[PDB]
């Protein structure tokens, strides 16, 4: 991974994969929530 | 692309390392790390 944009693309791909294969799992939830937050960089946490 | 579950976990781990290194205090670093940990747990019929 060379930069943030590539890292976000890879994270989104992984979230999609776990949603498809393990849809109601805690792993699918956490991966998806990580992708969500990657698109909200200005949200204070 | 991702060909199987092992590869998905491996990619998740690489993403978690990238964010740990570049944005250690962000929600993305924290969540990607937890997701990666949880991906190593035994499977269940969720």
Author numbering:
A (entry chain A): 303 to 347
B (entry chain B): 302 to 347
In the authors' words:
Contractile bacteriophages of the family Myoviridae (i.e. T4), R-type pyocins and the type VI secretion system (T6SS) of Gram-negative bacteria are evolutionarily related nano-scale injection machines that puncture target cell membranes using a shared contraction mechanism. Consistent with this, phylogenetic analysis has suggested that the TssA family can be subdivided into three clades (TssA1, TssA2 and TssA3).
Nested deletion of consecutive helical segments of TssA1B CTD revealed that loss of α15 resulted in the failure of the protein to assemble into a high molecular weight ring, and structure determination of the construct H12–H14 (helices α12–α14) and of that consisting of α12 and α13 alone (residues 303–347), revealed them both to be dimers. In the assembled Bc TssA1B CTD ring, analysis by PISA32 revealed an extensive dimer interface (~950 Å2) between monomers in the different layers, which principally involves the interaction of residues located in helices α12–α13 with their two-fold related subunits forming a region of hydrophobic packing with hydrophilic interactions at the periphery.
